[PDB]
């Protein structure tokens, strides 16, 4: 439109370097405007930076500065919010100066009070009705003049209440004056409209440009402004012009901040109305878009899955997903070798998906990690880098040890992935964010990556003992011979025995001291000792190794040995624990959960105790309040007896 909310003259042109009429439509003539039509020439995204204005007929007031919280218009003038709110409308005017007439300098008054006061004096005293009264009082109230009186009044007036109250007002007035912004600019004379491209017209069903919340609110402010602008020229009466001033003030107030007021629409198939406050707020303050960053390029996600074959510093990245993620790097790698003649040819090859393109993917995914990330990021371990392992499948293969850090159960919870471009980010990903480096947790000294379920169960199955088994009493050389007997199935995996083992130790200052002795240890413990890399003692292996003891072994190796050997040792514990679990083949059946034989006897005694307590109530001795405490103690004690009976039976029988 010629002078609309979307415009060529006011806002900006449609096409890139072209006029609306179509006279000057070339890059050669890029400075000059149009002669016939009203429109300049520029880029397609010049509308989003450019803006216009709307000349208000009556002086309006701002939405925030009126309300907000402390009321900056009220505290500057020195008056209450209730009187200022009523003064802003058109029901009760405020007096503007005049010490001759018997009235205050900022005194509110009713229409009847104004009529009675005007009859006596009329002239000399003055009192504007609406926001023009606040605009007149704003520029009249001098900051420098009031500051001089406040300084003298503070020293002169010897009092606690007077000095304390005056100090707060003087500091706020001095800071407001010293900044630059005067009181006259709080009330709005001109209203700047927003860029058109930043409030675009979304098409409805059937291709109809429906008006957005911005466009509807700006339309209302223009309609009431054009109404009031003519009414002043027409010379309408005081009631009609005052009513137009209210709706103009309400239209501007609703546009600037739609809240704590009349509120437009309100659940009329489109919520309230996106005001200028609600765009700056949005999703409870502009966090998601600006501060957070929102969605990112070179990103993806898929359903998680088990990955025991993949070691601690890698993950199973999908082949189809990884092709799109490193799409720019395939164009460079193909063109560098000389397969693709140009960018257009390189685009055609990767889209068609030829056999040669798959070999290029592995070439640029060797020393280039992938930042895996879960949705609920509680701590730093919620984001971590891994080496991208190529695998034929859409599901992402997460590591077993890293699962404890994420707290990621594999029951339909998709983890996102990110591709770090450039060198310094890849160096930061490989150094700082790496899983091999990030072993210990930030909150506590204990290890984050540790044995959880399958590794812990298999470790207990291997590292264990019994009363009697096949090949118990038999001495042997070492773990190589002990493994041969256990794997073949002559000697049992868990049995009482004694075998030799050269246990190393770092006793001296920076030196590995040798040692050897025929220590008492089981067949499974002898086979499990091979995972312990040299320096670890024999006392740690010869044990149950259940959760706490297993986790303590990883922490002890980190302090003694270092980061390198513990990273390998923690991996081998997972491989040994996973393999040992398959050998045992445990299974919680129906008959496995064996209840105690004295449950019926304990239940009869507990039930009889309740009848004895109930018998005392009907008799006379026991009371209603004492019955609740007595019955609860018997029931709680019976549960302990039943639990202890099951604990005694199931543990050792």
């Amino acid at each position: 439109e010629r002078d609309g909310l979307f415009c060529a003259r006011i806002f900006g042109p449609v096409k890139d370097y072209e006029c609306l009429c179509g006279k000057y439509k070339r890059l050669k003539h890029r400075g000059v405007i149009c002669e016939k039509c009203g429109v300049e020439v520029t880029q397609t995204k010049v509308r989003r930076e450019r803006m216009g204005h709307i000349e208000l007929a009556s002086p309006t007031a701002h939405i925030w500065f009126l309300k907000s919280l402390p009321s900056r218009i009220g505290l500057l003038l020195d008056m209450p919010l209730r009187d200022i709110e009523r003064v802003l409308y058109f029901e009760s005017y405020v007096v503007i100066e005049g010490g001759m007439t018997n009235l205050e300098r900022q005194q509110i008054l009713t229409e009847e009070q104004y009529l009675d006061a005007l009859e006596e004096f009329g002239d000399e005293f003055d009192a504007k009705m609406g926001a023009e009264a606040i605009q007149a009082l704003l520029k009249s109230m001098d900051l420098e003049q009031e500051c001089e009186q406040l300084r003298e009044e503070l020293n002169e007036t010897n009092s606690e209440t007077k000095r304390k109250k005056l100090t707060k007002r003087i500091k706020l007035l001095e800071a407001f004056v010293q900044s630059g912004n005067k009181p006259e600019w709080m009330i709005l004379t001109v209203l700047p409209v927003l860029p058109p491209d930043l409030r675009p017209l979304v098409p409805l069903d059937g291709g109809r440009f429906a008006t957005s919340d911005l466009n509807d609110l700006y339309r209302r402010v223009i309609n009431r402004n054009n109404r009031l602008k003519r009414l002043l020229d027409l010379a309408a009466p005081d009631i009609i012009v005052r009513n137009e001033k209210r709706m103009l003030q309400e239209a501007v107030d609703a546009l600037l901040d739609n809240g704590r007021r009349g509120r437009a629409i309100t659940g009329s198939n489109k919520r309230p109305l996106k005001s200028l406050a609600d765009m700056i707020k949005g999703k409870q303050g502009r966090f998601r878009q600006n501060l957070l960053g929102k969605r990112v390029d070179y990103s993806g996600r898929s359903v998680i899955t088990v990955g025991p074959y993949l070691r601690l510093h890698q993950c199973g990245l999908p082949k189809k997903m990884a092709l799109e993620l490193f799409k720019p790097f395939i164009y460079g790698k193909l063109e560098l070798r000389g397969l693709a003649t140009t960018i257009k040819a390189a685009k055609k090859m990767v889209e068609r998906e030829e056999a040669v393109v798959w070999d290029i993917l592995d070439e640029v995914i060797r020393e280039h990690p992938v930042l895996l990330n879960r949705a609920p990021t509680l701590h730093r371990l919620g984001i971590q880098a891994f080496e991208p392992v190529l695998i034929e499948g859409k599901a992402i293969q997460l590591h077993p040890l890293v699962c404890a850090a994420y707290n990621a159960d594999f029951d339909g919870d998709q983890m996102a992935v990110h591709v770090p471009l450039t060198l310094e980010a890849q160096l930061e990903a490989r150094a700082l964010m790496m899983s091999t480096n990030n072993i210990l947790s930030p909150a506590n000294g204990e290890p984050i990556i540790v044995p959880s379920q399958d590794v812990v169960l298999g470790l207990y199955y291997m590292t264990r003992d019994c009363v009697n088994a096949k090949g118990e009493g038999m001495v042997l050389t070492g773990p190589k011979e002990a493994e041969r007997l256990y794997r073949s199935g002559l000697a049992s995996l868990h049995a009482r025995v004694k075998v030799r083992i050269t246990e190393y130790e770092k006793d001296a200052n920076g030196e590995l001291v040798a040692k050897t002795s025929l220590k008492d240890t089981t067949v499974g413990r002898a086979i499990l000792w091979m995972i312990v890399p040299k320096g670890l003692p024999y006392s740690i292996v010869n044990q149950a190794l259940g959760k706490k003891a297993i986790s303590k072994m990883l922490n002890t190796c980190y302090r003694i040995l270092g980061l390198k050997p513990t990273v390998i040792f923690a991996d081998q514990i997972m491989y040994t624990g996973f393999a040992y679990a398959a050998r045992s083949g445990a299974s919680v059946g129906i008959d496995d959960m064996v209840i105690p034989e004295k449950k019926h006897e304990i239940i009869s005694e507990a039930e009889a105790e309740v009848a004895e307590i109930q018998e005392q109530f009907q008799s006379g001795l026991v009371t209603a309040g004492e019955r609740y405490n007595k019955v609860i103690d018997i029931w709680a004690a019976a549960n302990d007896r039943v639990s202890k009976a099951m604990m005694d039976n199931l543990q050792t029988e």
């Binding site: 209840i595 239940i603 019976a638």
Partner: protein, 50 residues
Amino acid sequence: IETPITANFREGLNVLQYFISTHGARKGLADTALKTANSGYLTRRLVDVA
């Protein structure tokens, strides 16, 4: 409650014990869901403080 849950998960649980036990699952689900909001609210202000 007055009458405690006598029967186990291995044995056949009666209707009264299930109708009593359903409150613990419903309330426990609400408290854990509410605790997740409290955890998200707690880590917000602790992060903003430092």
